[PDB]
Amino acid sequence: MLTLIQGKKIVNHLRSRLAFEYNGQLIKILSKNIVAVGSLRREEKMLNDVDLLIIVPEKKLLKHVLPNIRIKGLSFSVKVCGERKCVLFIEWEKKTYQLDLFTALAEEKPYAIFHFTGPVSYLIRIRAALKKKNYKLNQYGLFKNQTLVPLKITTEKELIKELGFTYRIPKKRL
DNA sequence: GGCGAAGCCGGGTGCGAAGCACC
Numbered sequence: 001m002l003t004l005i006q007g008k009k010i011v012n013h014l015r016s017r018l019a020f021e022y023n024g025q026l027i028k029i030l031s032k033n034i035v036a037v038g039s040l041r042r043e044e045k046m047l048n049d050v051d052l053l054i055i056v057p058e059k060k061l062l063k064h065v066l067p068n069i070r071i072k073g074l075s076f077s078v079k080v081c082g083e084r085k086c087v088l089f090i091e092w093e094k095k096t097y098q099l100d101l102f103t104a105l106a107e108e109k110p111y112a113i114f115h116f117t118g119p120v121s122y123l124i125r126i127r128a129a130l131k132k133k134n135y136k137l138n139q140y141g142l143f144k145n146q147t148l149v150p151l152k153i154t155t156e157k158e159l160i161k162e163l164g165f166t167y168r169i170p171k172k173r174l
Numbered sequence: 175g176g177c178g179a180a181g182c183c184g185g186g187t188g189c190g191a192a193g194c195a196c197c
């Protein structure tokens with residue numbers, strides 16, 4: 001497996017050096033539009049897979065990062081994942097790892113963070129628990145009888161206090 | 175089976191044969 005320092009280093013590398021294609025040209029990606037996801041946030045001592053969160057604030061460029069996102073001078077294979085997820089194979093130091101990224105709207109950030117930070121069952125439990133509150137909670141926002149309702153916050157306690165739930169630490173397992 | 179507002183159970187797509195399998 002990999003190590004925290006390496007994860008942090010690659011995270012730093014990705015945090016200070018990413019890049020993406022743009023209408024035939026290329027644009028670099030730095031820290032403010034990038035967040036980390038993985039064992040580090042869950043606090044694991046064994047790094048299986050280290051992920052990241054990359055959201056776009058612009059409504060158009062949101063889909064401009066989607067085209068071709070990459071780094072300068074490395075081994076990487078990027079394919080589509082799931083529905084609209086990004087599956088990357090990364091090779092460096094003669095080593096290849098599997099990175100599953102996701103790029104979404106900056107407003108999805110809290111929900112995204114919440115969804116991405118803990119466990120599916122909690123997510124579903126939370127989803128149903130919340131749905132049963134007569135509201136459907138998805139990356140996009142809150143859906144009500146096919147109606148769409150967006151978020152008003154940008155933070156975690158904010159999101160929990162926004163929906164009306166408590167923040168449970170992964171280590172407690174739901 | 176377990177549940178905070180009553181009756182409920184994520185969201186979808188890349189394929190391979192429209193049905194299964196991952197994030």
Ligand SMILES: Nc1nc2c(ncn2[C@H]2C[C@H](O)[C@@H](COP(=O)(O)OP(=O)(O)OP(=O)(O)O)O2)c(=O)[nH]1
Nearest residue numbers: 037038039042048049050051100115116117120197
């Ligand atoms: N694999 C998987 N990921 C899901 C699911 N639902 C939501 N996600 C999220 C979790 C992450 O935000 C992203 C998947 O990342 P990974 O495959 O690396 O797993 P995750 O990061 O949750 O665990 P980790 O801390 O990296 O070992 O999609 C699901 O059902 N399966």
